[PDB]
Short mmCIF file of C-alpha atoms in Angstrom, two decimals:
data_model
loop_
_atom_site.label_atom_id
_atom_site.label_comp_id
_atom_site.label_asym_id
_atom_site.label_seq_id
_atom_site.Cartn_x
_atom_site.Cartn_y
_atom_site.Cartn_z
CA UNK Y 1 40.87 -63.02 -12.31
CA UNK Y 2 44.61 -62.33 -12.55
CA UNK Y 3 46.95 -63.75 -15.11
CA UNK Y 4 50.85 -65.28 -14.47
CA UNK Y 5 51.10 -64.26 -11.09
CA UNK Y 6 55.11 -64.62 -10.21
CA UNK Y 7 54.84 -62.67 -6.51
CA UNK Y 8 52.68 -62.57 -3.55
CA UNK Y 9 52.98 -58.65 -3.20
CA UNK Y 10 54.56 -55.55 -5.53
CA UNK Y 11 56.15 -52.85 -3.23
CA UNK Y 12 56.08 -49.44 -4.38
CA UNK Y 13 57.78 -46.38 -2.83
CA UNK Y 14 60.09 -43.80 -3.00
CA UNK Y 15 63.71 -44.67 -2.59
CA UNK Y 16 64.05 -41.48 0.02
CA UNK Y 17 61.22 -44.19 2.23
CA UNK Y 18 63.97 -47.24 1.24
CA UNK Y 19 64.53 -47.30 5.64
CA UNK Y 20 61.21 -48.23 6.62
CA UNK Y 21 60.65 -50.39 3.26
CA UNK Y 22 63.40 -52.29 3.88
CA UNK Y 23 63.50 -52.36 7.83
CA UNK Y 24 60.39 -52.57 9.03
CA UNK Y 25 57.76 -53.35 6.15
CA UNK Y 26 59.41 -56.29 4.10
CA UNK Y 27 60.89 -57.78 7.66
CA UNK Y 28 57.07 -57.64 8.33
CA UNK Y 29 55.80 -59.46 5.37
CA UNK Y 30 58.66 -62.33 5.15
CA UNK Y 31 56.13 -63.51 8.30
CA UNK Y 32 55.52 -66.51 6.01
CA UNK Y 33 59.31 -66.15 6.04
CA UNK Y 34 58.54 -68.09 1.19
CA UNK Y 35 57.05 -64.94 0.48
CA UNK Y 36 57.75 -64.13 -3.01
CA UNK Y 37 57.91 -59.80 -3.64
CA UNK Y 38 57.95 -57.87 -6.36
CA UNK Y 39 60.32 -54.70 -6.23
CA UNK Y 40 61.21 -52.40 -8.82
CA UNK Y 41 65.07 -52.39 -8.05
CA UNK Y 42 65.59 -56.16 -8.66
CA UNK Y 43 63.02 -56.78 -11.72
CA UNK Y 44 62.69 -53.67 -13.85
CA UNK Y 45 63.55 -54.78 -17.36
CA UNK Y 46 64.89 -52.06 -19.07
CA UNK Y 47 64.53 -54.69 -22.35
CA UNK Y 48 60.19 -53.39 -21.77
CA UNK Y 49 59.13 -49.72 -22.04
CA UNK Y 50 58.94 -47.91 -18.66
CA UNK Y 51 55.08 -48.35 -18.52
CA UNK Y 52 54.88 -52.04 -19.99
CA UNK Y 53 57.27 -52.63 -16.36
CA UNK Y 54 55.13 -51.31 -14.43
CA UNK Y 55 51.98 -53.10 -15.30
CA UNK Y 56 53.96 -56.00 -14.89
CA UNK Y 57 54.67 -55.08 -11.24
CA UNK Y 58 51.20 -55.06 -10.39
CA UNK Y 59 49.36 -57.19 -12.48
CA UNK Y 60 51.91 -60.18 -11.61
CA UNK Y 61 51.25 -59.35 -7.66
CA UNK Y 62 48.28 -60.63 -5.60
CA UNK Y 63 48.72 -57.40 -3.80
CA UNK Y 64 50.48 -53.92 -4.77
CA UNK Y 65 51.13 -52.26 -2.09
CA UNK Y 66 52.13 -47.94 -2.14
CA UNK Y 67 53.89 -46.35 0.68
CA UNK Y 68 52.66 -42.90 -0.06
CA UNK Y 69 54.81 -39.65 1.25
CA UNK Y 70 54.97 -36.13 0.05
CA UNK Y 71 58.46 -37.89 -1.92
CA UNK Y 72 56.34 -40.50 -2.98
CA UNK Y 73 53.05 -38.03 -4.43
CA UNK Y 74 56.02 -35.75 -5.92
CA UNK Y 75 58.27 -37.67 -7.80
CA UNK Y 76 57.26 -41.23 -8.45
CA UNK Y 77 53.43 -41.10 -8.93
CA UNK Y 78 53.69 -39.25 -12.03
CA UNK Y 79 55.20 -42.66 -13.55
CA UNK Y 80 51.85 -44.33 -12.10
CA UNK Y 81 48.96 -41.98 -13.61
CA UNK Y 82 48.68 -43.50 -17.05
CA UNK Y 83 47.40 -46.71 -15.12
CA UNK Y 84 45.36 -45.48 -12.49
CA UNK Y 85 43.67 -42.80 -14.84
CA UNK Y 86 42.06 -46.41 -16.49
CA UNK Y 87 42.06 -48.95 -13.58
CA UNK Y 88 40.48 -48.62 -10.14
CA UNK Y 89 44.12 -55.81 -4.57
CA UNK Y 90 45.84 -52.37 -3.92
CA UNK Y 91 46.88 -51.66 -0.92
CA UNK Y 92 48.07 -47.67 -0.11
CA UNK Y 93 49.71 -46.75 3.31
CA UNK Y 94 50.55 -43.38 4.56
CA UNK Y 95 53.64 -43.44 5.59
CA UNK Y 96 53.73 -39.68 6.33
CA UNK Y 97 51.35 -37.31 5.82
CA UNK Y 98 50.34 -35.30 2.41
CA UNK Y 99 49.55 -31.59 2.69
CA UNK Y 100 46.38 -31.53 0.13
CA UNK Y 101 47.89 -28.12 -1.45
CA UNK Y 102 50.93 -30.09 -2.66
CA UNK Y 103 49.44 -32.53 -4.44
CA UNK Y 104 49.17 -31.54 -8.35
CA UNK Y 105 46.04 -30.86 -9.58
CA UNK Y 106 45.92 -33.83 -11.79
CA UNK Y 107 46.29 -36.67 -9.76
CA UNK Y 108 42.51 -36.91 -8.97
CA UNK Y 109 41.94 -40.39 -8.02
CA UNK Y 110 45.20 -40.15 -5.42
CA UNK Y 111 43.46 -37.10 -3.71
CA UNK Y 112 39.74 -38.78 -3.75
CA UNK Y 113 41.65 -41.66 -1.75
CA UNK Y 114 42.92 -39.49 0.22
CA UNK Y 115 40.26 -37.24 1.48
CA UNK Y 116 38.42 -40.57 1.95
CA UNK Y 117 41.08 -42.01 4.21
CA UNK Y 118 41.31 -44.78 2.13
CA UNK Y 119 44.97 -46.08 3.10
CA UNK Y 120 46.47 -47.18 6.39
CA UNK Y 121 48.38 -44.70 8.87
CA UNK Y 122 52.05 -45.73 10.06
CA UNK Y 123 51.99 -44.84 13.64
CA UNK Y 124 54.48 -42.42 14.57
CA UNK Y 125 53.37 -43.43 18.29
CA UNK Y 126 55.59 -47.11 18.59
CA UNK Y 127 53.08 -48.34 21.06
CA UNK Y 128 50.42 -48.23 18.32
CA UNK Y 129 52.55 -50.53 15.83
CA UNK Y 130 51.18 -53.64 16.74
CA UNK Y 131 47.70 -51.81 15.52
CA UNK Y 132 48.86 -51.20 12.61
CA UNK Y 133 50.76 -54.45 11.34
CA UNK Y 134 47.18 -56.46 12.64
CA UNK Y 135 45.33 -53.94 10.26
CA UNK Y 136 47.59 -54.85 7.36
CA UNK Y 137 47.95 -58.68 7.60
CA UNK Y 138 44.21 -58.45 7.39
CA UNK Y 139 44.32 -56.41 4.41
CA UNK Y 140 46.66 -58.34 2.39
CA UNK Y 141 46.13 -62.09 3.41
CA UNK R 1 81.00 -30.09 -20.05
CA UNK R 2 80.90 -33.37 -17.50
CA UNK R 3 78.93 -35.26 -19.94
CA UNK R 4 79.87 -38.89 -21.19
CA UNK R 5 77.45 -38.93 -24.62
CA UNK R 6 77.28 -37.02 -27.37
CA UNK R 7 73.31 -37.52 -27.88
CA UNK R 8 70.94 -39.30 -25.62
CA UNK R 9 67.94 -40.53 -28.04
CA UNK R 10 64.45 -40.99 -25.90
CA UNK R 11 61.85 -42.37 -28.20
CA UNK R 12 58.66 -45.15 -28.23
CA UNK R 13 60.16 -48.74 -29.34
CA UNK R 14 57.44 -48.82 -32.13
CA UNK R 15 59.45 -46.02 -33.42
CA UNK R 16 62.60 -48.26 -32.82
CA UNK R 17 63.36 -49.24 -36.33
CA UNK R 18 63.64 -45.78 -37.29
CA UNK R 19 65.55 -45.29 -34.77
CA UNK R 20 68.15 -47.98 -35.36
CA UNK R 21 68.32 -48.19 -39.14
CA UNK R 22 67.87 -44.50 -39.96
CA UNK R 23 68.61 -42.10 -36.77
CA UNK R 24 71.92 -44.01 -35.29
CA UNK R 25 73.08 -45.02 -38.59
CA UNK R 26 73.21 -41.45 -39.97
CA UNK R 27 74.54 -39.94 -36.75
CA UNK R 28 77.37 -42.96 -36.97
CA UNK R 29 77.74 -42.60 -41.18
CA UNK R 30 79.72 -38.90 -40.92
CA UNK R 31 80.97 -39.23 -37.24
CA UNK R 32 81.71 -43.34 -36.69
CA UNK R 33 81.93 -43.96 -33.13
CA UNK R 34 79.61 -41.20 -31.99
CA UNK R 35 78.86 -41.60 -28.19
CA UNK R 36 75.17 -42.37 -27.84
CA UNK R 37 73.02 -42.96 -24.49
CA UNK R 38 69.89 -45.32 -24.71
CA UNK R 39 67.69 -46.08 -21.72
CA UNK R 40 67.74 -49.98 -22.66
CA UNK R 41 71.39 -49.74 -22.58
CA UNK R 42 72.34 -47.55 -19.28
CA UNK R 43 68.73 -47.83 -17.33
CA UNK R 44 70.14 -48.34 -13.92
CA UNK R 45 67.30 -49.76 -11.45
CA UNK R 46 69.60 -48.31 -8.64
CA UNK R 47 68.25 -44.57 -9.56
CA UNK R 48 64.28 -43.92 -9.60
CA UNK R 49 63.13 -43.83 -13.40
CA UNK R 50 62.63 -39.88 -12.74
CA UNK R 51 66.59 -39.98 -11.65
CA UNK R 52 67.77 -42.46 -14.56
CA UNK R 53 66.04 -40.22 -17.28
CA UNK R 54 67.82 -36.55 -15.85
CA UNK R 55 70.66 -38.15 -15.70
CA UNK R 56 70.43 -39.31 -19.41
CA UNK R 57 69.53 -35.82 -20.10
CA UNK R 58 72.51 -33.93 -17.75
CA UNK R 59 75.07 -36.45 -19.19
CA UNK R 60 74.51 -36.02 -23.09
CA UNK R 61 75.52 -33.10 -24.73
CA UNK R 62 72.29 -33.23 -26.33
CA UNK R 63 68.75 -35.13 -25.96
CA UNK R 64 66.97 -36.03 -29.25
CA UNK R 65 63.15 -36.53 -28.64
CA UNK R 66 61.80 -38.59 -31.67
CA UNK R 67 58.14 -37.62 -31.32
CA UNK R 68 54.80 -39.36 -33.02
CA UNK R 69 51.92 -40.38 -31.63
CA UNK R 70 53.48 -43.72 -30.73
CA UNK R 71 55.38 -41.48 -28.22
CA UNK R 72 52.91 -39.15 -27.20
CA UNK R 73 50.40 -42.16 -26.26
CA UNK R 74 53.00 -44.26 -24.12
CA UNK R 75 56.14 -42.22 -23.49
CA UNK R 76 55.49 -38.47 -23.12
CA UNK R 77 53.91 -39.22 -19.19
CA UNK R 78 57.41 -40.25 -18.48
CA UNK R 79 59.13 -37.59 -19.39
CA UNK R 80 57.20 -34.37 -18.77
CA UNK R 81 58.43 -33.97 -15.09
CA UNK R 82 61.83 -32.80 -16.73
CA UNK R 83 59.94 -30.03 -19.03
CA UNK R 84 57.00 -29.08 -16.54
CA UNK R 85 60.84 -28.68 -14.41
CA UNK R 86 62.44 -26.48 -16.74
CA UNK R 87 59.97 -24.27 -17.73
CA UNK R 88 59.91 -25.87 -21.28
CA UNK R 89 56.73 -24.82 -22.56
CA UNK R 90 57.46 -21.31 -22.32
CA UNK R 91 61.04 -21.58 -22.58
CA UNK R 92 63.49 -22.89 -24.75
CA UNK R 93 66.42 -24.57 -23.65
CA UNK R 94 69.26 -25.06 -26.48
CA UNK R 95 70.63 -29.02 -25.95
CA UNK R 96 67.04 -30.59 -26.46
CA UNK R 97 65.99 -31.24 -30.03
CA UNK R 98 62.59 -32.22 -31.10
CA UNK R 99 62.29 -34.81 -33.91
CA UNK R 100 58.70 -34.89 -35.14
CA UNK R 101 58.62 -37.97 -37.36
CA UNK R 102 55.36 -38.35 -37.31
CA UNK R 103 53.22 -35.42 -37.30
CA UNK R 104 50.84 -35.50 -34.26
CA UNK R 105 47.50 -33.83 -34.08
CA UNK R 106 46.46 -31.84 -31.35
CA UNK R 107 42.68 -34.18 -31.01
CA UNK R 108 56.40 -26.58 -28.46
CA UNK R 109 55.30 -24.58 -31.00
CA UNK R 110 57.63 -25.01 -34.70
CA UNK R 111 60.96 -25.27 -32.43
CA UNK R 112 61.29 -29.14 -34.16
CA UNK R 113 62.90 -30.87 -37.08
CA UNK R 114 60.39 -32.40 -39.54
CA UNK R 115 60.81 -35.70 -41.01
CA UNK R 116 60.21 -35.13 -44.65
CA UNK R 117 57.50 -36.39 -46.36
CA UNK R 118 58.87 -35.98 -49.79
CA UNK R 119 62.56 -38.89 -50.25
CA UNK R 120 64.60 -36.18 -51.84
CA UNK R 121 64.71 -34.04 -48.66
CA UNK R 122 65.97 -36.81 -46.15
CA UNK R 123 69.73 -35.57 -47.06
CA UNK R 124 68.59 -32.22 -46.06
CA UNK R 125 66.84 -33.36 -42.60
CA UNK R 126 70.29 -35.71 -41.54
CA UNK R 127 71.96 -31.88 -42.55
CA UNK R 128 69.95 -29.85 -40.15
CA UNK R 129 70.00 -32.72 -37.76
CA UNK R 130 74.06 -32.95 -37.27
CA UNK R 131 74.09 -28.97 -37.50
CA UNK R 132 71.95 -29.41 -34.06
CA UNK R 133 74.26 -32.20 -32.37
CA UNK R 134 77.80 -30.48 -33.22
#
């Protein structure tokens, strides 16, 4: 049961993925149009520790939601493996595709999910979009 | 030769008080208004935390590390995309200083500056430690 919950939903991405964040995705969401989310440009504190930040982002979320890319696996999840080497609500989206042989060799949980298909595809196909946006409102709720 | 500080210090905040009543101080006490960069002081949530820390690094004429175990445990995962980057661990690379205040088990090799155990050798250590900043 989660504790001082301040947003409905924690976005986390690469900056380089900002376009589809920011045009499509959170556009998407804001369909309660009230919807209170959590983004790492407009509440990191730099008064906490990097790490103490982001368990804030996503333990004061209903949902976190990752928009995994190769710029994603490569330069932000490194910031996100102290947590998810302890902790198993998230949501992960592949927002473009992740050659296995890139991924370090570390990041075991990311590449479990992965070969799993644990996450939900963006649709490079527009027809397919609707598809897509369904899946996820049923996802998050 | 673009940088803006002098010495950007990256260190845990139960460290802190060392930091700001024994590190700063002593850096300030022979060189007053020393330019120093501190992540809760120019952290800019425009950059990604990866972009924020090399540009603390790129922009100081040196980088301190204070390393302990309080570091180690909650800072180090932060920070080793810049030396996995530069080669690091093999290599040495002559504005990064190592602080070990705290010695840390293994449960670098001898590149660092010690924090003396024995009083009468903290002198000394603030010695060796603006040799490595000028």
């Amino acid at each position: 049961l989660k504790r001082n919950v301040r947003f409905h939903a924690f976005i986390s991405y690469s900056e380089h993925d900002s376009l589809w964040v920011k045009n499509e995705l959170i556009p998407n969401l804001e369909k309660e149009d009230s919807i209170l989310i959590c983004l790492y440009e407009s509440y990191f504190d730099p008064g906490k520790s990097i790490s103490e930040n982001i368990v804030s982002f996503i333990e004061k979320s209903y949902k976190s939601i990752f928009v995994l890319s190769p710029n994603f696996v490569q330069n932000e999840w490194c910031h996100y493996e102290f947590y998810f080497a302890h902790h198993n609500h998230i949501i992960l989206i592949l927002l473009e595709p992740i050659p296995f042989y890139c991924i370090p060799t570390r990041y075991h949980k990311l590449k479990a999910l992965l070969e799993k298909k644990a996450y939900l595809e963006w649709p490079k196909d527009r027809r397919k979009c609707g598809l897509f946006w369904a899946n996820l409102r049923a996802a998050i709720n």
